[PDB]
Symmetry: C6
Subunit: 29 residues, 6 copies
Amino acid sequence: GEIAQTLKEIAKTLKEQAWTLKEIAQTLK
Amino acid sequence: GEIAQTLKEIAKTLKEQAWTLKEIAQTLKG
Amino acid sequence: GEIAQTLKEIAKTLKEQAWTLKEIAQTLKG
Amino acid sequence: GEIAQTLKEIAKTLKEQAWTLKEIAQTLKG
Amino acid sequence: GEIAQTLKEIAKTLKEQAWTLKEIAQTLKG
Amino acid sequence: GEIAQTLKEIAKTLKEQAWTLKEIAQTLK
């Protein structure tokens, strides 16, 4: 349903954010 | 329902945050 | 109910965070 | 119930994080 | 069940993240 | 369910993000 699809979008976005934070961490290091 | 709509709003907001973080990462890099 | 209200609070807080991240992005540019 | 209480904890923590991010934004700016 | 347990894990992790953000804020300040 | 599995993925991703934030904190320190 809509809820399952929306949660999957949230999961995908958080994974993208996690990768971006890793980029930031690497840049700072 | 209200909960489904609110979760969609959360999803949209998180996507906005993700984009902003990408901008920050790019700015820091160069 | 309580769950829907709590999710709305989460949504509002994430929107606040999103705005703050935009401020940070702007500051880092100069 | 347990889910509602856990979501409330999440909401409170996100609000704390939002305040801390504002502190970071302010520090970076000046 | 699984949902409640998973949300508790999320709550714990977010609390850890909140503390780490406070560390970042403190480092930037001083 | 799909919801429970998606939340587990979210939990794992947030843990990764938490570790990355710690890396950022350490770099700044």
